[PDB]
């Protein structure tokens, strides 16, 4: 093999797939075109079986002969003939050999143990640096700085050992299936297997008495009624059907998804009810979604996107710097064994050992701060792209309207007088009208829930009699949707003679009705609540003394109205968002005319705000460009955005720029409306509620879901409000996060260029800065108000001003340059003010530097250095357009006090034997030391107070550019 290239690595991925080519040459070998690393095999059970993991798939593909890969949907062109052929149980010797191909049908989480996780965290060239460091320092015996370093770099390993761990127990714990089930054999048995042993081609047989669900089956045989919450959130009871003879992800009322919980289950046509497993572990629902976690896509977050200028800047200050110390040591008269050490030992202050720690803690605050309010976010790094959100697309039903219809209440007909809508049902008298409402139903009492159609189910206590004076007689005709209404006749003690009741639609029915009884005004009665997003059903009754002679010759009663309403909390934040200028489009897949009536309550569509139809043609024709009259907004369509992005391409981004309302929307279209505004440089959010949306929540850079306790449908922030009210608390906590991990950057980067600056200023005169002064500084300076600053909190108003988004710019840059220079003035400034004194004796320059120096060169210097990194946290952590102020944070307060008041005492009045300061300042210097600490103090607050308000006189995302043509003349002619 002379595969020994191990030896040569001891030596030391940046080019991993230059690495490989040391590695090896039609087998173990796999370039799966990310990274290129998936090399596996098994080659077990007396075949082939190529056996490799890519993410979790198994991939049956060793060669094109026998073999093929893609184990999920390599029996997916099957007949619904094949799966009723399959009702018997597979073969228990050859039950054992699906085994080898599919999966042991459980989603798994490694359990990634202490020592192996442990090294796959310091295994980096940030935490070797600092290994590198430890054995640096020590050099110069014994030091307390080599200590600290250690104790600082076990809290950045032991912050990231906590975030890997409570994420890895968060995704073990919805996937806990632990079950045993029962299955039949080939010939009449039972055999009760655990779940981990289920192969597709097997049978299944449900409990009926409870039960969550084995593994996505299809329901074969017999009746089911489920509880779809844990896959979709929609927790209302779905009945499922068994399959007909003649397609898994089309026919989803006869698939029993993995996950979902299993209640009635009854049989009705043999002794138990029978179904045919269709996926297994990581191939089914809830394990597709579960890989898309653990796998997650790379998110559009570039930050510090630059990726050299940081890099090439740290050269430079490490370099221009660390030769101005062998420019300067050299001139001191040096043996030259130690002059290159003093040199690493300024570069390894220039990289603080507390920046991954700190930068860590930001994000676990941030998960903190959503879970008090609702929002339950899993992957830590989608929170800073809440605060870059220009668009925020909707779904309407449950979303930000009601879930379901809502009566408003009776239009009756007594005489085709036409009496008004009454505001209650309940005060209307009873008659053949009012016992009608309350009996026609397809409904079922069974353990206390009324379930069924969800609309009938809202008449029943829109009035409030008892069910279960009228009697459940017959059900004539059943509410199919082919002939669209639904005949009940109903029997009451003291009648003549049973009536016959049915409703259905106003126009299907009345044109069935007695024309003598229905009246001329019944189209216009139609028009008026067709036009306006109400659904309205009619109902009619006929005395009988079978066949449809149950629905003929109908008198016309009365009318019913149906209305989704908004929710309170929907109004004050669709207008929150658009006072805001992020843009608000609603995705719907319902009416287009009810649609509209709701975009212009809610504040989509502003009045005095046009908007225009399109209404594109199925023939390759022009838009029609219908208007309405009742900036400038376009309502599209369902087949009409299918004939814009096929047929006119040229003309797709302008009307995703300026279209508002879509509506009759695919749920497979959802998600091409995401992706093609994502190509217009938009970052689009979803806030979403259902299944019809779990296309969209995923492609989305911010997918929210609405109304659920703990799941995995959403992209991440699944919340649990069940108002749109979230939405901009992702927006307003999105955008305090992503300057606080500004501004604990350039706090850093501060804080290491004043220490770079005090052990150079120390550098010359041969007098470096102490042992546990440099302890002192680290650990408790500057690590108590960095792991502390990130406490704030986020604003109460949101505003127009988005954050800068960029690391790297030009106000970043020039803050910390002028702060800077306010910082070594001030050291110049105090080394040089000591130098005048009469009391004042230099240092024994020629001893060492570390060994026998407690001299006055360095007391100054550490006192006005601790203060600087006192005065520039506070400096550098404002909050006025974003976050908070920071006399809010109140364990930040007490950090800046304490610590200034200990060091206002190691210069006032000890710490003198340990930090080995001079004994004792004798004058009445020290009162004027803290007056250069006070201008610096003042002069920190009043030069950012300035920097900020500067503009410099001199559309980068393609959305903008089209907004700025669609300004200077409108699109539409």
Same mark, same amino acid.
């Given at each position: 093999?002379?595969?020994?290239?191990?030896?040569?690595?001891?030596?030391?991925?940046?080019?991993?797939?230059?690495?490989?080519?040391?590695?090896?040459?039609?087998?173990?070998?796999?370039?799966?075109?990310?990274?290129?690393?998936?090399?596996?095999?098994?080659?077990?059970?007396?075949?082939?079986?190529?056996?490799?993991?890519?993410?979790?798939?198994?991939?049956?593909?060793?060669?094109?002969?026998?073999?093929?890969?893609?184990?999920?949907?390599?029996?997916?062109?099957?007949?619904?003939?094949?799966?009723?052929?399959?009702?018997?149980?597979?073969?228990?010797?050859?039950?054992?050999?699906?085994?080898?191909?599919?999966?042991?049908?459980?989603?798994?989480?490694?359990?990634?143990?202490?020592?192996?996780?442990?090294?796959?965290?310091?295994?980096?060239?940030?935490?070797?640096?600092?290994?590198?460091?430890?054995?640096?320092?020590?050099?110069?015996?014994?030091?307390?700085?080599?200590?600290?370093?250690?104790?600082?770099?076990?809290?950045?390993?032991?912050?990231?050992?906590?975030?890997?761990?409570?994420?890895?127990?968060?995704?073990?714990?919805?996937?806990?299936?632990?079950?045993?089930?029962?299955?039949?054999?080939?010939?009449?048995?039972?055999?009760?297997?655990?779940?981990?042993?289920?192969?597709?081609?097997?049978?299944?047989?449900?409990?009926?008495?409870?039960?969550?669900?084995?593994?996505?089956?299809?329901?074969?045989?017999?009746?089911?009624?489920?509880?779809?919450?844990?896959?979709?959130?929609?927790?209302?009871?779905?009945?499922?059907?068994?399959?007909?003879?003649?397609?898994?992800?089309?026919?989803?009322?006869?698939?029993?998804?993995?996950?979902?919980?299993?209640?009635?289950?009854?049989?009705?046509?043999?002794?138990?009810?029978?179904?045919?497993?269709?996926?297994?572990?990581?191939?089914?629902?809830?394990?597709?979604?579960?890989?898309?976690?653990?796998?997650?896509?790379?998110?559009?977050?570039?930050?510090?996107?630059?990726?050299?200028?940081?890099?090439?800047?740290?050269?430079?200050?490490?370099?221009?710097?660390?030769?101005?110390?062998?420019?300067?040591?050299?001139?001191?008269?040096?043996?030259?064994?130690?002059?290159?050490?003093?040199?690493?030992?300024?570069?390894?202050?220039?990289?603080?050992?507390?920046?991954?720690?700190?930068?860590?803690?930001?994000?676990?605050?941030?998960?903190?701060?959503?879970?008090?309010?609702?929002?339950?976010?899993?992957?830590?790094?989608?929170?800073?792209?809440?605060?870059?959100?220009?668009?925020?697309?909707?779904?309407?039903?449950?979303?930000?309207?009601?879930?379901?219809?809502?009566?408003?209440?009776?239009?009756?007909?007594?005489?085709?007088?036409?009496?008004?809508?009454?505001?209650?049902?309940?005060?209307?008298?009873?008659?053949?009208?009012?016992?009608?409402?309350?009996?026609?139903?397809?409904?079922?009492?069974?353990?206390?829930?009324?379930?069924?159609?969800?609309?009938?189910?809202?008449?029943?206590?829109?009035?409030?009699?008892?069910?279960?004076?009228?009697?459940?007689?017959?059900?004539?005709?059943?509410?199919?949707?082919?002939?669209?209404?639904?005949?009940?006749?109903?029997?009451?003690?003291?009648?003549?003679?049973?009536?016959?009741?049915?409703?259905?639609?106003?126009?299907?029915?009345?044109?069935?009705?007695?024309?003598?009884?229905?009246?001329?005004?019944?189209?216009?009665?139609?028009?008026?609540?067709?036009?306006?997003?109400?659904?309205?059903?009619?109902?009619?009754?006929?005395?009988?003394?079978?066949?449809?002679?149950?629905?003929?010759?109908?008198?016309?009663?009365?009318?019913?109205?149906?209305?989704?309403?908004?929710?309170?909390?929907?109004?004050?934040?669709?207008?929150?968002?658009?006072?805001?200028?992020?843009?608000?489009?609603?995705?719907?897949?319902?009416?287009?005319?009810?649609?509209?009536?709701?975009?212009?309550?809610?504040?989509?569509?502003?009045?005095?705000?046009?908007?225009?139809?399109?209404?594109?043609?199925?023939?390759?024709?022009?838009?029609?460009?219908?208007?309405?009259?009742?900036?400038?907004?376009?309502?599209?369509?369902?087949?009409?955005?299918?004939?814009?992005?096929?047929?006119?391409?040229?003309?797709?981004?302008?009307?995703?720029?300026?279209?508002?309302?879509?509506?009759?929307?695919?749920?497979?279209?959802?998600?091409?409306?995401?992706?093609?505004?994502?190509?217009?440089?938009?970052?689009?959010?979803?806030?979403?509620?259902?299944?019809?949306?779990?296309?969209?929540?995923?492609?989305?850079?911010?997918?929210?879901?609405?109304?659920?306790?703990?799941?995995?449908?959403?992209?991440?922030?699944?919340?649990?409000?069940?108002?749109?009210?979230?939405?901009?608390?992702?927006?307003?906590?999105?955008?305090?996060?992503?300057?606080?991990?500004?501004?604990?950057?350039?706090?850093?980067?501060?804080?290491?260029?004043?220490?770079?600056?005090?052990?150079?200023? #120390? !550098? =010359?005169?041969?007098?470096? @800065?102490?042992? +546990?002064?440099? &302890?002192?500084?680290? *650990? $408790?300076?500057?690590?108590? /108000?960095?792991?502390?600053?990130?406490?704030?909190?986020?604003?109460?108003?949101?505003?127009?001003?988005?954050?800068?988004?960029?690391?790297?710019?030009?106000?970043?840059?020039?803050?910390?340059?002028?702060?800077?220079?306010?910082?070594?003035?001030?050291?110049?400034?105090?080394?040089?003010?000591?130098?005048?004194?009469?009391?004042?004796?230099?240092?024994?320059?020629?001893?060492?530097?570390?060994?026998?120096?407690?001299?006055?060169?360095?007391?100054?210097?550490?006192?006005?250095?601790?203060?600087?990194?006192?005065?520039?946290?506070?400096?550098?952590?404002?909050?006025?357009?974003?976050?908070?102020? #920071? !006399? =809010?944070?109140?364990?930040? @307060?007490?950090? +800046?006090?304490? &610590?200034?008041?200990? *060091? $206002?005492?190691?210069?006032? /009045?000890?710490?003198?034997?340990?930090?080995?300061?001079?004994?004792?300042?004798?004058?009445?210097?020290?009162?004027?030391?803290?007056?250069?600490?006070?201008?610096?103090?003042?002069?920190?607050?009043?030069?950012?107070?300035?920097?900020?308000?500067?503009?410099?006189?001199?559309?980068?995302?393609?959305?903008?550019?089209?907004?700025?043509?669609?300004?200077?003349?409108?699109?539409?002619?």
């Amino acid at each position: 093999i002379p595969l020994l290239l191990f030896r040569w690595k001891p030596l030391w991925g940046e080019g991993s797939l230059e690495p490989s080519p040391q590695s090896q040459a039609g087998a173990w070998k796999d370039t799966a075109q990310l990274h290129k690393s998936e090399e596996a095999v098994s080659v077990g059970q007396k075949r082939v079986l190529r056996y490799y993991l890519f993410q979790g798939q198994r991939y049956i593909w060793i060669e094109t002969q026998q073999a093929f890969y893609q184990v999920s949907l390599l029996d997916h062109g099957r007949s619904c003939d094949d799966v009723h052929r399959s009702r018997h149980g597979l073969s228990l010797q050859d039950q054992m050999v699906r085994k080898a191909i599919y999966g042991p049908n459980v989603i798994s989480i490694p359990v990634k143990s202490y020592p192996q996780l442990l090294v796959d965290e310091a295994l980096n060239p940030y935490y070797g640096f600092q290994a590198f460091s430890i054995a640096l320092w020590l050099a110069d015996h014994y030091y307390w700085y080599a200590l600290c370093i250690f104790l600082i770099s076990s809290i950045s390993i032991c912050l990231s050992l906590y975030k890997t761990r409570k994420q890895s127990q968060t995704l073990r714990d919805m996937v806990k299936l632990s079950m045993r089930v029962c299955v039949c054999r080939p010939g009449g048995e039972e055999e009760w297997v655990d779940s981990s042993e289920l192969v597709p081609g097997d049978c299944l047989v449900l409990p009926q008495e409870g039960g969550l669900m084995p593994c996505d089956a299809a329901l074969v045989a017999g009746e089911c009624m489920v509880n779809e919450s844990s896959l979709t959130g929609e927790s209302i009871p779905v009945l499922k059907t068994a399959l007909p003879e003649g397609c898994a992800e089309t026919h989803r009322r006869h698939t029993l998804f993995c996950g979902t919980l299993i209640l009635q289950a009854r049989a009705y046509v043999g002794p138990h009810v029978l179904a045919v497993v269709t996926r297994t572990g990581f191939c089914t629902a809830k394990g597709g979604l579960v890989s898309s976690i653990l796998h997650p896509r790379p998110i559009n977050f570039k930050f510090y996107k630059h990726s050299m200028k940081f890099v090439a800047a740290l050269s430079v200050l490490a370099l221009l710097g660390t030769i101005y110390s062998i420019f300067i040591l050299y001139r001191n008269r040096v043996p030259l064994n130690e002059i290159v050490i003093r040199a690493l030992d300024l570069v390894t202050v220039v990289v603080p050992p507390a920046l991954p720690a700190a930068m860590t803690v930001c994000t676990l605050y941030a998960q903190s701060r959503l879970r008090r309010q609702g929002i339950f976010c899993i992957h830590p790094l989608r929170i800073n792209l809440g605060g870059k959100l220009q668009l925020v697309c909707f779904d309407k039903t449950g979303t930000l309207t009601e879930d379901g219809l809502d009566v408003m209440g009776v239009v009756p007909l007594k005489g085709q007088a036409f009496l008004p809508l009454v505001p209650e049902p309940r005060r209307l008298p009873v008659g053949p009208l009012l016992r009608a409402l309350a009996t026609c139903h397809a409904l079922s009492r069974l353990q206390d829930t009324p379930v069924g159609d969800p609309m009938d189910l809202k008449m029943v206590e829109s009035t409030g009699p008892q069910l279960q004076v009228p009697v459940s007689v017959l059900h004539r005709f059943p509410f199919s949707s082919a002939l669209q209404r639904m005949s009940v006749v109903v029997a009451w003690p003291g009648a003549t003679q049973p009536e016959a009741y049915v409703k259905g639609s106003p126009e299907l029915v009345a044109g069935l009705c007695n024309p003598e009884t229905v009246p001329t005004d019944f189209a216009q009665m139609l028009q008026s609540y067709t036009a306006a997003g109400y659904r309205v059903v009619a109902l009619a009754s006929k005395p009988l003394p079978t066949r449809d002679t149950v629905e003929g010759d109908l008198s016309l009663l009365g009318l019913l109205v149906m209305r989704n309403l908004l929710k309170p909390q929907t109004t004050p934040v669709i207008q929150a968002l658009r006072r805001t200028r992020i843009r608000a489009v609603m995705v719907t897949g319902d009416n287009l005319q009810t649609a509209v009536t709701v975009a212009r309550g809610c504040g989509m569509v502003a009045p005095q705000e046009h908007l225009i139809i399109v209404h594109a043609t199925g023939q390759p024709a022009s838009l029609e460009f219908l208007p309405m009259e009742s900036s400038r907004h376009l309502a599209l369509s369902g087949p009409t955005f299918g004939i814009i992005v096929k047929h006119f391409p040229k003309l797709l981004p302008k009307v995703l720029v300026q279209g508002t309302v879509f509506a009759r929307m695919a749920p497979e279209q959802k998600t091409e409306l995401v992706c093609e505004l994502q190509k217009l440089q938009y970052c689009v959010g979803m806030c979403g509620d259902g299944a019809n949306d779990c296309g969209a929540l995923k492609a989305a850079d911010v997918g929210i879901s609405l109304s659920q306790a703990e799941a995995s449908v959403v992209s991440p922030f699944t919340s649990s409000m069940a108002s749109i009210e979230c939405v901009p608390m992702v927006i307003r906590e999105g955008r305090c996060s992503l300057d606080t991990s500004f501004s604990v950057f350039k706090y850093m980067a501060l804080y290491s260029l004043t220490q770079f600056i005090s052990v150079l200023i #120390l !550098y =010359t005169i041969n007098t470096n @800065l102490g042992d +546990l002064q440099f &302890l002192a500084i680290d *650990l $408790v300076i500057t690590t108590t /108000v960095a792991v502390l600053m990130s406490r704030t909190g986020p604003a109460l108003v949101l505003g127009r001003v988005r954050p800068p988004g960029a690391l790297l710019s030009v106000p970043v840059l020039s803050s910390l340059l002028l702060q800077m220079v306010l910082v070594t003035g001030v050291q110049l400034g105090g080394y040089f003010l000591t130098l005048a004194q009469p009391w004042f004796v230099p240092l024994n320059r020629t001893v060492a530097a570390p060994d026998n120096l407690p001299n006055y060169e360095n007391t100054v210097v550490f006192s006005l250095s601790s203060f600087q990194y006192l005065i520039l946290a506070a400096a550098v952590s404002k909050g006025a357009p974003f976050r908070r102020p #920071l !006399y =809010t944070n109140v364990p930040f @307060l007490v950090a +800046l006090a304490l &610590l200034s008041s200990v *060091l $206002v005492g190691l210069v006032l /009045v000890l710490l003198q034997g340990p930090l080995a300061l001079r004994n004792i300042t004798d004058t009445g210097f020290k009162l004027l030391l803290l007056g250069l600490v006070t201008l610096n103090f003042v002069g920190a607050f009043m030069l950012e107070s300035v920097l900020d308000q500067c503009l410099p006189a001199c559309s980068k995302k393609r959305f903008k550019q089209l907004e700025r043509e669609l300004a200077e003349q409108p699109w539409p002619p």
